[PDB]
Amino acid sequence: KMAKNVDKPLFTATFNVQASSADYATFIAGIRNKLRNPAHFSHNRPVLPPVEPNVPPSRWFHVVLKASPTSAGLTLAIRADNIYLEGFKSSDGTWWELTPGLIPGATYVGFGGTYRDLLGDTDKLTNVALGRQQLADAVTALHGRTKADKPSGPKQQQAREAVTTLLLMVNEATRFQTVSGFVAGLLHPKAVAAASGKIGNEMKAQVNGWQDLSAALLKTDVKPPPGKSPAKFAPIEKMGVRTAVQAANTLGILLFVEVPGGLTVAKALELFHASGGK
Ligand SMILES: Nc1ncnc2[nH]cnc12
């Protein structure tokens, strides 16, 4: 069935694309903070609540990206359970969606939301230029989209690149301190030359293995069976992550994963609701 409450965000995070590096870090930190299950941290990193079983996706938040403090922003509709971008709202009021039939009253943008859909391959992630101008152009491209505009291959290619830019600079930055830190480091005052950069293979591997890295750290919290030794972190070498300390410094917020001996979906949602979570 269709998603619910896409129009009723649990919170809205706003960033002015011309704002400082520190304000970008505050913006990303605040998203993580509002997404977290207050009852579930791992090594002092927040864990998302589980995905609600046996209902359509019904927990959403909004990100608003502004070209200026007084500009109307581009609104992104993102799932609050797995931080998946599914919709965006252009200046003419049109909700555009990345999955056909998912969001009530939305218009399908013409391409899917996966990196395979956007890039052709999750390996081209290391080709995406990240920076302040790239962010501004991305907001402009998507915010400027109009329903009435006739179909265009070049316009589609622009939109795909724009969505990819935001996924890395918003969604992946939320998920990963490596990514958020990399992006914040490219953001400078106007007295500094315009800058951009591209992620390396470690951050590409992290982005492509968010569930794996999350589960790997979560397993370390599991109380060990009688007669056996407590679980040690298992390095994911492609991610450049070899210790739990490195995992914690890497993870911005963990995807909930059921690991043997860990919290179940039901139990983790129970603790989430008990701590005031919605
Ligand atoms: N639409 C999307 N939202 C979040 N992460 C993604 N990774 C690939 N596609 C994504």
Side-chain angles (χ1 to χ4, degrees), residues 2-278:
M2 292 196 177
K4 292 181 46 55
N5 306 310
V6 182
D7 44 341
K8 298 166 172 317
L10 293 163
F11 64 94
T12 299
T14 300
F15 180 64
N16 157 32
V17 306
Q18 294 298 318
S20 69
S21 205
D23 283 355
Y24 170 81
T26 297
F27 159 72
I28 297 289
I31 295 176
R32 295 170 181 162
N33 179 249
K34 297 189 159 184
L35 280 174
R36 77 192 174 185
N37 183 345
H40 191 193
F41 283 75
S42 177
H43 302 246
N44 201 16
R45 297 312 304 157
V47 185
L48 287 157
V51 170
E52 294 175 324
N54 311 315
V55 291
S58 315
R59 299 185 59 257
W60 296 82
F61 69 102
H62 285 179
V63 163
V64 174
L65 302 178
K66 298 182 165 199
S68 89
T70 51
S71 298
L74 169 79
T75 308
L76 307 180
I78 306 176
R79 293 180 54 155
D81 47 13
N82 62 5
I83 319 174
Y84 212 83
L85 175 65
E86 286 288 5
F88 65 88
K89 191 172 162 182
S90 55
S91 52
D92 67 348
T94 311
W95 273 106
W96 301 92
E97 67 188 343
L98 289 155
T99 305
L102 180 61
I103 300 179
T107 300
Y108 181 53
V109 70
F111 51 81
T114 79
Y115 288 134
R116 180 164 103 181
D117 297 328
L118 302 170
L119 293 171
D121 179 19
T122 48
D123 245 332
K124 272 72 175 313
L125 279 184
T126 58
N127 290 330
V128 182
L130 308 177
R132 190 190 294 285
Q133 198 57 51
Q134 291 76 9
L135 171 68
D137 292 352
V139 175
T140 300
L142 299 180
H143 199 218
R145 195 179 175 87
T146 71
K147 211 173 196 166
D149 270 355
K150 79 180 59 50
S152 163
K155 291 196 185 183
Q156 292 294 108
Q157 190 41 56
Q158 182 187 58
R160 277 188 291 272
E161 297 177 359
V163 171
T164 303
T165 297
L166 301 191
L167 283 184
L168 280 165
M169 293 181 76
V170 177
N171 307 66
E172 307 296 2
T174 297
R175 289 167 172 145
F176 296 102
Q177 306 192 248
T178 47
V179 173
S180 64
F182 183 79
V183 166
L186 291 163
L187 296 185
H188 311 288
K190 275 177 283 288
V192 175
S196 75
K198 300 179 280 183
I199 72 178
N201 290 334
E202 296 86 0
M203 275 181 289
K204 184 187 67 199
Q206 294 156 15
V207 161
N208 289 326
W210 184 41
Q211 179 175 304
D212 286 336
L213 180 56
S214 296
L217 189 60
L218 288 168
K219 286 171 180 179
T220 73
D221 297 331
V222 172
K223 256 66 187 206
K228 290 177 85 296
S229 301
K232 160 84 164 43
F233 186 80
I236 307 188
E237 189 55 36
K238 256 223 189 191
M239 291 182 191
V241 178
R242 298 180 179 176
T243 68
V245 170
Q246 287 171 0
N249 279 320
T250 297
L251 289 158
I253 179 167
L254 283 72
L255 175 69
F256 182 81
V257 189
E258 290 191 311
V259 307
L263 287 179
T264 59
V265 170
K267 187 65 168 178
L269 278 168
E270 170 181 316
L271 300 189
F272 177 67
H273 295 145
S275 66
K278 292 170 81 288

